[PDB]
Amino acid sequence: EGSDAPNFVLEDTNGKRIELSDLKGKGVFLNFWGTWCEPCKKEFPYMANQYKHFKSQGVEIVAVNVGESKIAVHNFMKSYGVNFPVVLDTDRQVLDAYDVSPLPTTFLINPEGKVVKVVTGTMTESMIHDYMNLIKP
């Protein structure tokens, strides 16, 4: 069932604009994070490993960075082996549209574009696997 996921358009660290509604038809694992955030750091390698399994099953990750710069985010991506889309919520407009407080917070969006599950806090690799299975087409 779910609720409609608020649409947004944000850049990646190359300046490419990504619009959430353009990912309809795929599951979207929408993860809010910051470079300073320890529970975020812990789960990033798990996300990358699971993405290897689920990209070919029609799950996309969109990891929304809260407020930091292209260079800070680039450096983090390289350090953590990020192999999936990362966008920059430069002014917290997307954070606020999702009503996110602590980091990380994750929204599991089905192929219809509806939020079916919300997860606050760090996620184990087993949990991430389950979450991606939930939203795959």
Side-chain angles (χ1 to χ4, degrees), residues 36-105:
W36 46 270
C37 166
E38 209 72 41
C40 304
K41 288 167 172 190
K42 187 79 184 322
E43 74 194 359
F44 258 91
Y46 308 153
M47 288 167 60
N49 198 49
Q50 293 299 127
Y51 191 61
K52 294 179 170 186
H53 186 78
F54 283 101
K55 187 183 168 81
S56 65
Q57 303 195 245
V59 178
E60 188 59 285
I61 297 171
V62 179
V64 181
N65 174 274
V66 183
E68 297 174 283
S69 70
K70 289 192 170 61
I71 186 61
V73 173
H74 163 96
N75 284 163
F76 184 100
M77 289 173 67
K78 296 304 198 187
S79 288
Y80 287 87
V82 175
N83 57 355
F84 48 81
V86 172
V87 295
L88 286 83
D89 187 28
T90 67
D91 70 3
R92 297 181 160 239
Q93 285 198 69
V94 182
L95 182 90
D96 286 342
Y98 280 79
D99 202 26
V100 172
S101 290
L103 302 178
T105 298

Short mmCIF file of all heavy atoms in Angstrom, two decimals, residues 36-105:
data_model
loop_
_atom_site.label_atom_id
_atom_site.label_comp_id
_atom_site.label_asym_id
_atom_site.label_seq_id
_atom_site.Cartn_x
_atom_site.Cartn_y
_atom_site.Cartn_z
N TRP A 36 30.28 12.14 8.68
CA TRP A 36 30.72 12.12 10.08
C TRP A 36 30.00 11.03 10.87
O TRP A 36 30.33 10.78 12.02
CB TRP A 36 30.56 13.52 10.66
CG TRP A 36 29.25 14.09 10.32
CD1 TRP A 36 28.90 14.84 9.21
CD2 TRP A 36 28.05 13.87 11.04
NE1 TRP A 36 27.55 15.10 9.23
CE2 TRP A 36 27.01 14.54 10.35
CE3 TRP A 36 27.75 13.22 12.24
CZ2 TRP A 36 25.71 14.54 10.81
CZ3 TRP A 36 26.47 13.21 12.69
CH2 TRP A 36 25.46 13.87 11.98
N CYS A 37 28.97 10.43 10.27
CA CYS A 37 28.00 9.59 10.96
C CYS A 37 28.50 8.15 11.08
O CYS A 37 28.58 7.44 10.08
CB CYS A 37 26.67 9.69 10.19
SG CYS A 37 25.42 8.46 10.57
N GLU A 38 28.84 7.72 12.30
CA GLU A 38 29.39 6.39 12.52
C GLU A 38 28.43 5.27 12.13
O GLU A 38 28.85 4.34 11.44
CB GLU A 38 29.90 6.22 13.98
CG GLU A 38 31.04 5.24 14.04
CD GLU A 38 32.31 5.86 13.42
OE1 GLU A 38 32.61 7.08 13.65
OE2 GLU A 38 32.98 5.16 12.68
N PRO A 39 27.16 5.32 12.55
CA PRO A 39 26.22 4.27 12.12
C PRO A 39 26.02 4.22 10.61
O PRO A 39 25.73 3.15 10.06
CB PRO A 39 24.93 4.55 12.92
CG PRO A 39 25.07 5.91 13.42
CD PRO A 39 26.55 6.20 13.57
N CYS A 40 26.26 5.36 9.95
CA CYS A 40 26.23 5.41 8.48
C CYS A 40 27.44 4.69 7.91
O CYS A 40 27.33 3.82 7.05
CB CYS A 40 26.18 6.87 7.94
SG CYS A 40 24.80 7.86 8.58
N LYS A 41 28.63 5.06 8.42
CA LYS A 41 29.86 4.43 7.98
C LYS A 41 29.79 2.91 8.12
O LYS A 41 30.24 2.20 7.24
CB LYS A 41 31.07 4.92 8.80
CG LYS A 41 31.48 6.37 8.47
CD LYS A 41 32.47 6.89 9.55
CE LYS A 41 33.06 8.23 9.20
NZ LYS A 41 34.17 8.52 10.17
N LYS A 42 29.25 2.43 9.22
CA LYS A 42 29.21 0.98 9.50
C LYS A 42 28.47 0.23 8.40
O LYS A 42 28.87 -0.87 8.02
CB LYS A 42 28.57 0.73 10.86
CG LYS A 42 28.63 -0.74 11.34
CD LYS A 42 29.98 -1.09 11.90
CE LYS A 42 30.05 -2.59 12.28
NZ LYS A 42 28.77 -3.05 12.88
N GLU A 43 27.37 0.81 7.92
CA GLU A 43 26.51 0.07 6.99
C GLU A 43 26.88 0.28 5.51
O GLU A 43 26.42 -0.48 4.66
CB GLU A 43 25.04 0.43 7.25
CG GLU A 43 24.66 1.82 6.76
CD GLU A 43 23.32 2.33 7.29
OE1 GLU A 43 22.64 1.59 8.05
OE2 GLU A 43 22.90 3.45 6.87
N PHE A 44 27.69 1.28 5.18
CA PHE A 44 28.03 1.53 3.78
C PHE A 44 28.63 0.32 3.07
O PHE A 44 28.20 0.02 1.95
CB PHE A 44 28.91 2.79 3.63
CG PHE A 44 28.15 4.00 3.16
CD1 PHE A 44 27.58 4.91 4.05
CD2 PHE A 44 27.99 4.22 1.83
CE1 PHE A 44 26.87 5.98 3.58
CE2 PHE A 44 27.31 5.31 1.34
CZ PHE A 44 26.68 6.18 2.20
N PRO A 45 29.60 -0.38 3.65
CA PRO A 45 30.15 -1.56 2.96
C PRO A 45 29.08 -2.63 2.73
O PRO A 45 29.14 -3.30 1.69
CB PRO A 45 31.28 -2.01 3.86
CG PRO A 45 31.68 -0.72 4.61
CD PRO A 45 30.34 -0.08 4.88
N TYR A 46 28.14 -2.78 3.66
CA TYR A 46 27.05 -3.74 3.50
C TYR A 46 26.15 -3.37 2.33
O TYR A 46 25.75 -4.22 1.54
CB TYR A 46 26.24 -3.84 4.78
CG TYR A 46 27.02 -4.10 6.04
CD1 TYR A 46 26.51 -3.67 7.26
CD2 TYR A 46 28.24 -4.79 6.04
CE1 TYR A 46 27.19 -3.91 8.46
CE2 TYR A 46 28.93 -5.01 7.23
CZ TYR A 46 28.40 -4.56 8.43
OH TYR A 46 29.07 -4.81 9.62
N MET A 47 25.85 -2.08 2.20
CA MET A 47 25.05 -1.59 1.11
C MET A 47 25.72 -1.91 -0.23
O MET A 47 25.07 -2.36 -1.17
CB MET A 47 24.84 -0.08 1.26
CG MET A 47 23.87 0.26 2.41
SD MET A 47 23.85 2.00 2.89
CE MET A 47 23.35 2.81 1.36
N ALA A 48 27.01 -1.63 -0.33
CA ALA A 48 27.77 -1.86 -1.56
C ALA A 48 27.79 -3.34 -1.93
O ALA A 48 27.60 -3.69 -3.09
CB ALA A 48 29.19 -1.31 -1.45
N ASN A 49 27.96 -4.20 -0.93
CA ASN A 49 28.03 -5.64 -1.21
C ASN A 49 26.69 -6.16 -1.68
O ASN A 49 26.59 -6.95 -2.65
CB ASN A 49 28.48 -6.42 0.01
CG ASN A 49 29.00 -7.83 -0.37
OD1 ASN A 49 29.82 -7.98 -1.30
ND2 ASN A 49 28.52 -8.83 0.35
N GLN A 50 25.61 -5.73 -1.03
CA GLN A 50 24.28 -6.14 -1.42
C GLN A 50 23.86 -5.56 -2.76
O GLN A 50 23.11 -6.21 -3.51
CB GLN A 50 23.26 -5.84 -0.32
CG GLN A 50 23.48 -6.68 0.91
CD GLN A 50 23.34 -8.17 0.63
OE1 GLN A 50 24.26 -8.98 0.96
NE2 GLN A 50 22.21 -8.54 0.07
N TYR A 51 24.31 -4.34 -3.10
CA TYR A 51 24.02 -3.76 -4.41
C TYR A 51 24.50 -4.64 -5.57
O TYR A 51 23.82 -4.74 -6.59
CB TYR A 51 24.64 -2.37 -4.51
CG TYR A 51 24.21 -1.54 -5.68
CD1 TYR A 51 22.90 -1.19 -5.88
CD2 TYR A 51 25.14 -1.11 -6.61
CE1 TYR A 51 22.53 -0.38 -6.94
CE2 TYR A 51 24.79 -0.31 -7.65
CZ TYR A 51 23.49 0.07 -7.82
OH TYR A 51 23.13 0.86 -8.87
N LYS A 52 25.64 -5.28 -5.36
CA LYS A 52 26.17 -6.25 -6.33
C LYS A 52 25.17 -7.33 -6.69
O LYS A 52 25.16 -7.80 -7.83
CB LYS A 52 27.47 -6.88 -5.82
CG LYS A 52 28.62 -5.88 -5.72
CD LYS A 52 29.91 -6.50 -5.18
CE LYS A 52 31.08 -5.52 -5.34
NZ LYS A 52 32.43 -6.09 -4.98
N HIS A 53 24.36 -7.74 -5.73
CA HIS A 53 23.35 -8.81 -5.90
C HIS A 53 22.03 -8.31 -6.44
O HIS A 53 21.35 -9.01 -7.19
CB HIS A 53 23.12 -9.48 -4.55
CG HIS A 53 22.22 -10.68 -4.60
ND1 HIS A 53 22.65 -11.92 -5.04
CD2 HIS A 53 20.94 -10.85 -4.22
CE1 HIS A 53 21.65 -12.78 -4.95
NE2 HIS A 53 20.60 -12.15 -4.46
N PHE A 54 21.64 -7.09 -6.05
CA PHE A 54 20.31 -6.60 -6.32
C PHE A 54 20.17 -5.61 -7.49
O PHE A 54 19.05 -5.38 -7.96
CB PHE A 54 19.73 -5.96 -5.05
CG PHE A 54 19.24 -6.98 -4.05
CD1 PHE A 54 20.01 -7.32 -2.94
CD2 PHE A 54 18.03 -7.58 -4.22
CE1 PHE A 54 19.55 -8.25 -2.02
CE2 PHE A 54 17.57 -8.53 -3.32
CZ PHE A 54 18.33 -8.85 -2.20
N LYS A 55 21.26 -5.06 -7.97
CA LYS A 55 21.12 -4.13 -9.11
C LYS A 55 20.46 -4.84 -10.31
O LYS A 55 19.58 -4.31 -10.98
CB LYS A 55 22.46 -3.54 -9.49
CG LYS A 55 22.37 -2.45 -10.53
CD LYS A 55 23.77 -1.97 -10.89
CE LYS A 55 23.77 -1.10 -12.11
NZ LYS A 55 23.37 0.30 -11.83
N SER A 56 20.86 -6.10 -10.56
CA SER A 56 20.28 -6.89 -11.64
C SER A 56 18.90 -7.46 -11.37
O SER A 56 18.33 -8.18 -12.20
CB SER A 56 21.24 -8.00 -12.02
OG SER A 56 21.41 -8.91 -10.97
N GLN A 57 18.36 -7.18 -10.19
CA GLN A 57 17.02 -7.51 -9.84
C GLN A 57 16.14 -6.28 -9.76
O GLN A 57 14.98 -6.34 -9.38
CB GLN A 57 17.03 -8.24 -8.50
CG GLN A 57 17.90 -9.50 -8.50
CD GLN A 57 17.59 -10.38 -7.30
OE1 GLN A 57 18.45 -10.56 -6.43
NE2 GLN A 57 16.34 -10.84 -7.21
N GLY A 58 16.65 -5.14 -10.22
CA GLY A 58 15.82 -3.95 -10.32
C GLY A 58 15.67 -3.15 -9.03
O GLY A 58 14.67 -2.46 -8.88
N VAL A 59 16.67 -3.22 -8.17
CA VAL A 59 16.76 -2.32 -6.99
C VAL A 59 17.84 -1.27 -7.24
O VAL A 59 18.92 -1.59 -7.69
CB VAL A 59 17.04 -3.10 -5.71
CG1 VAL A 59 17.17 -2.15 -4.51
CG2 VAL A 59 15.94 -4.10 -5.48
N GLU A 60 17.51 0.00 -7.01
CA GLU A 60 18.47 1.07 -7.02
C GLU A 60 18.65 1.62 -5.62
O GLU A 60 17.71 1.64 -4.83
CB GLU A 60 17.98 2.17 -7.94
CG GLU A 60 18.96 3.30 -8.23
CD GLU A 60 20.26 2.79 -8.85
OE1 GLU A 60 21.07 2.20 -8.09
OE2 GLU A 60 20.45 2.98 -10.08
N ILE A 61 19.88 2.03 -5.32
CA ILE A 61 20.16 2.78 -4.08
C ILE A 61 20.27 4.23 -4.49
O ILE A 61 20.94 4.55 -5.48
CB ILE A 61 21.44 2.32 -3.37
CG1 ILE A 61 21.36 0.87 -2.91
CG2 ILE A 61 21.78 3.28 -2.22
CD1 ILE A 61 22.66 0.32 -2.40
N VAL A 62 19.66 5.11 -3.70
CA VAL A 62 19.93 6.52 -3.77
C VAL A 62 20.34 6.96 -2.37
O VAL A 62 19.49 7.00 -1.47
CB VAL A 62 18.78 7.35 -4.33
CG1 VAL A 62 19.13 8.84 -4.34
CG2 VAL A 62 18.40 6.91 -5.73
N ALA A 63 21.63 7.27 -2.17
CA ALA A 63 22.16 7.65 -0.87
C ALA A 63 22.26 9.14 -0.82
O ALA A 63 23.13 9.74 -1.46
CB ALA A 63 23.46 6.97 -0.61
N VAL A 64 21.33 9.76 -0.10
CA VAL A 64 21.21 11.20 -0.01
C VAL A 64 22.10 11.75 1.10
O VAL A 64 21.84 11.51 2.28
CB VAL A 64 19.75 11.62 0.30
CG1 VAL A 64 19.63 13.10 0.36
CG2 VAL A 64 18.77 11.00 -0.69
N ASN A 65 23.17 12.45 0.71
CA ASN A 65 24.03 13.10 1.66
C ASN A 65 23.39 14.40 2.18
O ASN A 65 22.89 15.20 1.38
CB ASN A 65 25.39 13.43 1.02
CG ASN A 65 26.24 14.25 1.96
OD1 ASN A 65 26.11 15.47 1.97
ND2 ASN A 65 26.95 13.57 2.88
N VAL A 66 23.44 14.58 3.49
CA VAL A 66 22.82 15.74 4.12
C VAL A 66 23.80 16.90 4.25
O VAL A 66 24.55 16.97 5.21
CB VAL A 66 22.22 15.35 5.48
CG1 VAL A 66 21.51 16.56 6.12
CG2 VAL A 66 21.27 14.18 5.33
N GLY A 67 23.78 17.76 3.24
CA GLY A 67 24.36 19.08 3.35
C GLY A 67 25.84 19.27 3.05
O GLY A 67 26.29 20.40 3.05
N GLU A 68 26.57 18.21 2.76
CA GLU A 68 28.02 18.32 2.61
C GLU A 68 28.41 18.59 1.14
O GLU A 68 27.56 18.59 0.23
CB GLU A 68 28.70 17.08 3.20
CG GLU A 68 28.47 16.94 4.70
CD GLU A 68 29.02 15.66 5.28
OE1 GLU A 68 28.35 14.62 5.10
OE2 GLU A 68 30.10 15.71 5.91
N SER A 69 29.69 18.88 0.95
CA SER A 69 30.24 19.31 -0.33
C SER A 69 30.56 18.16 -1.27
O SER A 69 30.72 17.02 -0.84
CB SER A 69 31.50 20.13 -0.11
OG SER A 69 32.54 19.33 0.34
N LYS A 70 30.68 18.50 -2.56
CA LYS A 70 31.06 17.48 -3.53
C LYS A 70 32.39 16.82 -3.17
O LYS A 70 32.50 15.59 -3.27
CB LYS A 70 31.10 18.07 -4.96
CG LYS A 70 29.71 18.38 -5.51
CD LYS A 70 29.69 18.69 -7.02
CE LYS A 70 28.28 18.77 -7.66
NZ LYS A 70 27.37 19.84 -7.10
N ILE A 71 33.41 17.58 -2.74
CA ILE A 71 34.69 16.95 -2.42
C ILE A 71 34.59 16.06 -1.18
O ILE A 71 35.15 14.97 -1.15
CB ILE A 71 35.86 17.95 -2.35
CG1 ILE A 71 37.21 17.22 -2.15
CG2 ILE A 71 35.73 18.88 -1.22
CD1 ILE A 71 37.63 16.20 -3.30
N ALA A 72 33.88 16.53 -0.15
CA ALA A 72 33.72 15.68 1.04
C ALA A 72 33.04 14.37 0.71
O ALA A 72 33.44 13.29 1.15
CB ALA A 72 32.97 16.39 2.17
N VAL A 73 31.99 14.47 -0.08
CA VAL A 73 31.23 13.28 -0.46
C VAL A 73 32.03 12.35 -1.38
O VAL A 73 32.04 11.14 -1.17
CB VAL A 73 29.88 13.68 -1.04
CG1 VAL A 73 29.14 12.50 -1.59
CG2 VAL A 73 29.02 14.38 0.08
N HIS A 74 32.72 12.92 -2.36
CA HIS A 74 33.62 12.15 -3.23
C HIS A 74 34.62 11.36 -2.41
O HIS A 74 34.81 10.16 -2.63
CB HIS A 74 34.35 13.08 -4.16
CG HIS A 74 35.56 12.48 -4.82
ND1 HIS A 74 35.52 11.93 -6.08
CD2 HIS A 74 36.84 12.33 -4.39
CE1 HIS A 74 36.72 11.49 -6.41
NE2 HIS A 74 37.55 11.73 -5.41
N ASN A 75 35.30 12.02 -1.46
CA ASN A 75 36.30 11.35 -0.67
C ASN A 75 35.71 10.19 0.14
O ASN A 75 36.30 9.12 0.21
CB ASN A 75 37.03 12.32 0.26
CG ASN A 75 38.06 13.20 -0.43
OD1 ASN A 75 38.49 14.25 0.15
ND2 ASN A 75 38.47 12.84 -1.62
N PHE A 76 34.52 10.39 0.70
CA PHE A 76 33.85 9.36 1.43
C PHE A 76 33.50 8.17 0.52
O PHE A 76 33.72 7.01 0.86
CB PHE A 76 32.61 9.95 2.08
CG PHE A 76 31.85 8.96 2.98
CD1 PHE A 76 32.00 8.99 4.36
CD2 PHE A 76 30.99 8.03 2.44
CE1 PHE A 76 31.31 8.12 5.16
CE2 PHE A 76 30.30 7.17 3.25
CZ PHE A 76 30.45 7.22 4.59
N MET A 77 32.96 8.46 -0.65
CA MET A 77 32.58 7.42 -1.60
C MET A 77 33.80 6.56 -1.92
O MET A 77 33.71 5.34 -1.95
CB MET A 77 32.02 8.03 -2.88
CG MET A 77 30.65 8.66 -2.71
SD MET A 77 30.07 9.53 -4.13
CE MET A 77 29.85 8.17 -5.26
N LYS A 78 34.94 7.20 -2.19
CA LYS A 78 36.14 6.46 -2.54
C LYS A 78 36.61 5.62 -1.37
O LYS A 78 37.02 4.46 -1.54
CB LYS A 78 37.23 7.42 -3.04
CG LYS A 78 36.88 8.12 -4.30
CD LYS A 78 36.51 7.19 -5.47
CE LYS A 78 36.58 7.87 -6.80
NZ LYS A 78 36.05 7.00 -7.91
N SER A 79 36.53 6.17 -0.17
CA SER A 79 36.99 5.47 1.03
C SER A 79 36.16 4.26 1.37
O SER A 79 36.67 3.29 1.92
CB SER A 79 37.03 6.46 2.20
OG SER A 79 38.09 7.37 2.05
N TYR A 80 34.86 4.31 1.05
CA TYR A 80 33.92 3.25 1.43
C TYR A 80 33.51 2.35 0.26
O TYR A 80 32.59 1.53 0.40
CB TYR A 80 32.71 3.83 2.21
CG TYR A 80 33.13 4.22 3.62
CD1 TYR A 80 33.65 5.48 3.90
CD2 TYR A 80 33.12 3.31 4.67
CE1 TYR A 80 34.11 5.84 5.14
CE2 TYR A 80 33.57 3.68 5.93
CZ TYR A 80 34.08 4.92 6.15
OH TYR A 80 34.58 5.27 7.40
N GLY A 81 34.16 2.50 -0.90
CA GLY A 81 33.87 1.64 -2.03
C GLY A 81 32.48 1.73 -2.58
O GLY A 81 31.87 0.74 -2.98
N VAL A 82 31.97 2.96 -2.63
CA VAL A 82 30.59 3.18 -3.07
C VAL A 82 30.44 2.96 -4.55
O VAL A 82 31.10 3.60 -5.33
CB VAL A 82 30.11 4.58 -2.67
CG1 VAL A 82 28.73 4.87 -3.24
CG2 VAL A 82 30.13 4.75 -1.16
N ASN A 83 29.54 2.05 -4.90
CA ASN A 83 29.30 1.61 -6.24
C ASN A 83 27.88 1.93 -6.75
O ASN A 83 27.45 1.39 -7.77
CB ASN A 83 29.60 0.07 -6.35
CG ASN A 83 28.77 -0.80 -5.35
OD1 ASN A 83 28.07 -0.24 -4.52
ND2 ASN A 83 28.88 -2.14 -5.41
N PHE A 84 27.17 2.81 -6.01
CA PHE A 84 25.77 3.15 -6.27
C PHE A 84 25.58 4.66 -6.24
O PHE A 84 26.47 5.38 -5.79
CB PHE A 84 24.86 2.46 -5.24
CG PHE A 84 25.34 2.62 -3.82
CD1 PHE A 84 25.09 3.78 -3.09
CD2 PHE A 84 26.03 1.61 -3.18
CE1 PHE A 84 25.54 3.93 -1.80
CE2 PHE A 84 26.46 1.76 -1.89
CZ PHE A 84 26.22 2.93 -1.19
N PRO A 85 24.43 5.13 -6.73
CA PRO A 85 24.16 6.56 -6.75
C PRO A 85 24.15 7.26 -5.39
O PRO A 85 23.53 6.78 -4.43
CB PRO A 85 22.79 6.66 -7.44
CG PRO A 85 22.73 5.44 -8.30
CD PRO A 85 23.40 4.38 -7.46
N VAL A 86 24.84 8.39 -5.36
CA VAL A 86 24.89 9.29 -4.23
C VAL A 86 24.51 10.68 -4.69
O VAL A 86 25.09 11.16 -5.67
CB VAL A 86 26.32 9.32 -3.62
CG1 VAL A 86 26.45 10.40 -2.55
CG2 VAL A 86 26.68 7.94 -3.06
N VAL A 87 23.56 11.31 -3.99
CA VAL A 87 23.11 12.65 -4.35
C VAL A 87 23.33 13.60 -3.16
O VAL A 87 23.47 13.15 -2.01
CB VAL A 87 21.68 12.66 -4.83
CG1 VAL A 87 21.56 11.89 -6.13
CG2 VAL A 87 20.72 12.15 -3.77
N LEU A 88 23.31 14.90 -3.44
CA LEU A 88 23.66 15.91 -2.44
C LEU A 88 22.48 16.80 -2.11
O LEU A 88 22.03 17.61 -2.93
CB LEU A 88 24.86 16.74 -2.94
CG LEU A 88 26.21 15.98 -2.89
CD1 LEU A 88 26.35 15.15 -4.10
CD2 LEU A 88 27.38 16.94 -2.77
N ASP A 89 21.92 16.60 -0.93
CA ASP A 89 20.84 17.44 -0.42
C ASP A 89 21.46 18.67 0.22
O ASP A 89 21.56 18.81 1.45
CB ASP A 89 20.00 16.66 0.59
CG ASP A 89 18.78 17.35 1.03
OD1 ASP A 89 18.19 18.20 0.28
OD2 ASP A 89 18.31 17.05 2.17
N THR A 90 21.85 19.58 -0.62
CA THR A 90 22.71 20.67 -0.19
C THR A 90 22.07 21.59 0.82
O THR A 90 22.78 22.17 1.64
CB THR A 90 23.17 21.51 -1.37
OG1 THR A 90 22.07 22.22 -1.97
CG2 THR A 90 23.82 20.66 -2.43
N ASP A 91 20.76 21.73 0.75
CA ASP A 91 20.04 22.68 1.62
C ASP A 91 18.98 22.04 2.53
O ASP A 91 18.14 22.74 3.06
CB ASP A 91 19.46 23.79 0.77
CG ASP A 91 18.35 23.35 -0.06
OD1 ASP A 91 17.98 22.13 0.05
OD2 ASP A 91 17.80 24.14 -0.86
N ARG A 92 19.05 20.71 2.70
CA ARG A 92 18.18 19.96 3.59
C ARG A 92 16.72 19.99 3.15
O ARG A 92 15.86 19.55 3.91
CB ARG A 92 18.28 20.45 5.06
CG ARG A 92 19.63 20.28 5.65
CD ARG A 92 19.75 20.75 7.13
NE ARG A 92 20.92 20.11 7.73
CZ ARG A 92 20.94 19.32 8.80
NH1 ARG A 92 19.83 19.01 9.46
NH2 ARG A 92 22.12 18.84 9.23
N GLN A 93 16.42 20.40 1.94
CA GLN A 93 15.03 20.39 1.48
C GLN A 93 14.49 18.97 1.36
O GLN A 93 13.34 18.69 1.66
CB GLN A 93 14.87 21.14 0.16
CG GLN A 93 14.92 22.68 0.35
CD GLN A 93 14.35 23.41 -0.82
OE1 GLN A 93 13.13 23.35 -1.05
NE2 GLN A 93 15.19 24.09 -1.58
N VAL A 94 15.32 18.04 0.92
CA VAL A 94 14.86 16.66 0.82
C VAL A 94 14.79 15.98 2.19
O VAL A 94 13.80 15.30 2.47
CB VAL A 94 15.70 15.86 -0.20
CG1 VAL A 94 15.19 14.43 -0.34
CG2 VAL A 94 15.60 16.56 -1.56
N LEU A 95 15.78 16.21 3.05
CA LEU A 95 15.71 15.79 4.45
C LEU A 95 14.37 16.20 5.08
O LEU A 95 13.66 15.39 5.72
CB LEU A 95 16.85 16.44 5.25
CG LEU A 95 16.93 16.05 6.72
CD1 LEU A 95 17.82 14.82 6.92
CD2 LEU A 95 17.50 17.26 7.44
N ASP A 96 14.01 17.46 4.87
CA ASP A 96 12.78 17.97 5.48
C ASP A 96 11.52 17.43 4.86
O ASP A 96 10.54 17.15 5.57
CB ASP A 96 12.82 19.48 5.46
CG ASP A 96 13.78 20.03 6.51
OD1 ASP A 96 14.16 19.30 7.47
OD2 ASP A 96 14.18 21.19 6.45
N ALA A 97 11.54 17.17 3.56
CA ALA A 97 10.40 16.57 2.88
C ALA A 97 10.14 15.17 3.39
O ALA A 97 9.00 14.72 3.42
CB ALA A 97 10.64 16.55 1.38
N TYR A 98 11.22 14.46 3.79
CA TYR A 98 11.11 13.11 4.35
C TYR A 98 10.98 13.11 5.87
O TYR A 98 10.84 12.07 6.47
CB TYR A 98 12.28 12.23 3.85
CG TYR A 98 12.00 11.73 2.46
CD1 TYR A 98 12.18 12.52 1.35
CD2 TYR A 98 11.50 10.46 2.25
CE1 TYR A 98 11.85 12.04 0.05
CE2 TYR A 98 11.16 9.99 1.02
CZ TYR A 98 11.34 10.78 -0.09
OH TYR A 98 10.97 10.29 -1.32
N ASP A 99 11.04 14.29 6.48
CA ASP A 99 10.92 14.43 7.93
C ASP A 99 11.95 13.58 8.69
O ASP A 99 11.65 12.99 9.72
CB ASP A 99 9.47 14.14 8.37
CG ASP A 99 9.12 14.72 9.69
OD1 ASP A 99 9.71 15.74 10.10
OD2 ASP A 99 8.17 14.23 10.36
N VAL A 100 13.18 13.58 8.20
CA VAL A 100 14.26 12.81 8.82
C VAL A 100 14.90 13.63 9.95
O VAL A 100 15.12 14.82 9.79
CB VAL A 100 15.35 12.54 7.76
CG1 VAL A 100 16.60 11.93 8.35
CG2 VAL A 100 14.79 11.64 6.69
N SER A 101 15.15 12.93 11.06
CA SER A 101 15.87 13.49 12.20
C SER A 101 17.24 12.79 12.40
O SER A 101 18.22 13.27 11.84
CB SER A 101 14.94 13.47 13.40
OG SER A 101 13.92 14.42 13.26
N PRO A 102 17.34 11.67 13.07
CA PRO A 102 18.64 11.03 13.24
C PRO A 102 19.10 10.41 11.93
O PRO A 102 18.27 10.06 11.05
CB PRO A 102 18.36 9.94 14.27
CG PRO A 102 17.01 9.59 14.03
CD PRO A 102 16.30 10.86 13.70
N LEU A 103 20.42 10.25 11.83
CA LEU A 103 21.05 9.56 10.68
C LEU A 103 21.69 8.28 11.17
O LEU A 103 22.23 8.25 12.28
CB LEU A 103 22.10 10.42 10.01
CG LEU A 103 21.64 11.77 9.48
CD1 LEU A 103 22.81 12.53 8.87
CD2 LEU A 103 20.46 11.65 8.51
N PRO A 104 21.65 7.21 10.38
CA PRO A 104 20.91 7.11 9.10
C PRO A 104 19.41 6.92 9.30
O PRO A 104 18.95 6.36 10.31
CB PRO A 104 21.51 5.83 8.49
CG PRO A 104 21.89 4.99 9.65
CD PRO A 104 22.28 5.93 10.74
N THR A 105 18.66 7.33 8.30
CA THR A 105 17.26 6.91 8.12
C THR A 105 17.12 6.44 6.69
O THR A 105 17.64 7.10 5.78
CB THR A 105 16.30 8.08 8.41
OG1 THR A 105 16.44 8.49 9.78
CG2 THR A 105 14.83 7.67 8.28
#
